[PDB]
């Protein structure tokens, strides 16, 4: 097995093989106060929905 690699710049747009991110957490207002969501539930939202 004989190779020879050549590296170049580039970004994640051009190809996934670039981006240094790899998963990124994002959350806001964990306690739905702004009500930008309507929680699903069977009886009690607070208890059925993981804090």
């Amino acid at each position: 097995l004989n190779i020879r690699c050549i590296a170049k710049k580039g970004i994640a747009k051009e190809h996934a093989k670039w981006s240094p991110c790899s998963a990124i957490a994002f959350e806001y207002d964990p306690h739905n106060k702004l009500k930008h969501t309507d929680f699903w539930f069977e009886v009690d939202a607070k208890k059925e929905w993981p804090d």
């Binding site: 991110c21 790899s22 998963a23």
Partner: protein, 64 residues
């Protein structure tokens, strides 16, 4: 068929964790925990190794 550099789902590397894993098995007899310690939190990167089927082994028993 060998391990996949970077996990499809999120992107996190997973090339190194192979030898580490197959050891923490043979001796330390873990799964869940091993992984947890290997720094593999969320199921997304997780499923890659635990679902990997190393075919290459049988292939290597072939001549050319």
């Amino acid at each position: 068929m060998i391990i996949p550099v970077r996990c499809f789902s999120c992107g996190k590397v997973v090339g190194d964790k192979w030898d580490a894993y197959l050891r923490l098995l043979e001796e330390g007899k873990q799964e869940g925990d091993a992984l947890d310690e290997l720094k593999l939190k969320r199921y997304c990167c997780r499923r890659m190794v635990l679902t990997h089927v190393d075919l290459i082994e049988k292939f290597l028993r072939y001549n050319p």
